[PDB]
């Protein structure tokens, strides 16, 4: 542990005082956005939040509760949302307008992700058991994958828009090459409950979270299990997962944020937010020790790993 | 609620 980590705690550097299901930084880690049950996407300036004692710079009202946000990796001002009606919307945060409203899903969509390398491409997953790939220049889905169970999370590989990880209520991660969707490249078994999040640390390193109270690390080059992380409590809710090159962070039903170094199976540190509440969203500020977090009361905290 | 589907 000593060899890999130099941190022992998380410091609170800001707090903005109603579940927040998603908290995400824009392309430049300059703005961040929150969304959830209140049917409003709120955008904040990170530096203002850190420096000052708090008001969003943009708010966009929605027709449905929001489950996930994903900022565009090329168009700074564009952000996608998924909602409880199944609608996947692309918004412009400067004009406040919906640019695209994709309505093919028949049930709640739990997740949306904009590709980093082909930034007009976005993927969504839904309780309707479908994965849909969309292009911002086309109204109809480009790819549709019919699966056997509810899809809880979708994520593009950070190095290529040809690969997506799909976390399913069937307990497995289905890893697809979108150039041939007749069969996944590989299906990763190991979780004992639904897979609620999938996030990549790098081109070849995939992390997942599950309501079996574990995170897991997987090698998508050689299709291997790597490591299981334990300590947090997650038996029921979407509690958030975020990863960077070295660290994984997740929420807990004990109203605590947990941090793991990818080489160590038990936590580096944890933070009690302050059972009755659960952490509901987390997001690293790229490869830095700074993180955004939010809980089921709608409180937002900026945390920083510290010695 | 934000309960993860299972079964």
Numbering used by the authors:
A (entry chain A): 347 to 363, 372 to 407, 411 to 631, 643 to 675
B (entry chain B): 241 to 247
Provide the authors' own sentences about this structure as they appear in the paper.
The COP1 E3 ubiquitin ligase is a central signaling hub that integrates inputs from plant light‐sensing photoreceptors. COP1 contains an N‐terminal zinc finger, a central coiled‐coil, and a C‐terminal WD40 domain, which is essential for proper COP1 function (Deng et al, 1992; McNellis et al, 1994). COP1 regulates gene expression and plays a central role as a repressor of photomorphogenesis by directly modulating the stability of transcription factors that control the expression of light‐regulated genes.
Next, we obtained crystal structures for the different peptides bound to COP1 (1.3–2.0 Å resolution, see Tables EV1 and EV2, and EV4) to compare their peptide binding modes. We found that all peptides bind in a similar configuration with the VP forming the center of the binding site (r.m.s.d. between the different peptides range from ~ 0.3 to 1.5 Å, comparing 5 or 6 corresponding Cα atoms). Chemically diverse amino acids (Tyr/Arg/Gln) map to the −3 and −2 position and often deeply insert into the COP1 binding cleft, acting as anchor residues. This suggests that the COP1 WD40 domain has high structural plasticity, being able to accommodate sequence‐divergent VP‐containing peptides. C Superposition of the VP peptide binding modes of the HY5 (green), COL3 (orange), and STO (gray) peptides depicted in ball‐and‐stick representation when bound to the COP1 WD40 domain as observed in their respective X‐ray crystal structures.
